[PDB]
Every structure is written in C-alpha cells, then in structure tokens.
C-alpha cells in the first residue's frame, strides 16, 4: 500500500538529533507499507505555535530500512518532529 504512510507505521529509530553539521535529523522505521510518503512536520517544544519543520530533506520515504534519515531545522530553540503521530522534542542550539 505505497502511499501516505500510516501514523503507526513509523517508529522512533532515532529521535531528532543534530545532523552532524548544523541541522537536525531523525530516523524512523516502518511497519508495513513499502516506500511510503511519511507525513513529517515539527512543532516547537510540544507547541504547534509555528511549524519548525524546515526540512533540509523535504521528502522522507520509508523503505525496507524505514524512512532512513529526515533533516529538519529552525532558528535555535526547541524543535520536535511530529511524524504523523510520532513525536519527540530536541533542543537545537
């Protein structure tokens, strides 16, 4: 069922973590659907005040390894990625 992936199919493989350069990345693993378009967004410290999902990688698909890595960022503060129903805060400095 390759499509917009179900909100329960991705799993925290790696909560939002510094990409290794300056941006931030996360890792998610799938649970059924072949390469699917995962609904990734991000809020600020659990608050949907402003979508902090400025995706350095604005097209995450979940393949046999899951979504791989997703890049996101915003000016310093608390960025948490909300992959459908998946959520996890990260303080980016």
From Swiss-Prot:
It comes from the Viruses. Disulfide bonds join 5-36. It is a multi-pass membrane protein. It is found in: Virion membrane; Host endoplasmic reticulum membrane. This is Envelope protein E. The chain holds residues 583 to 675 of 776 of the full protein.
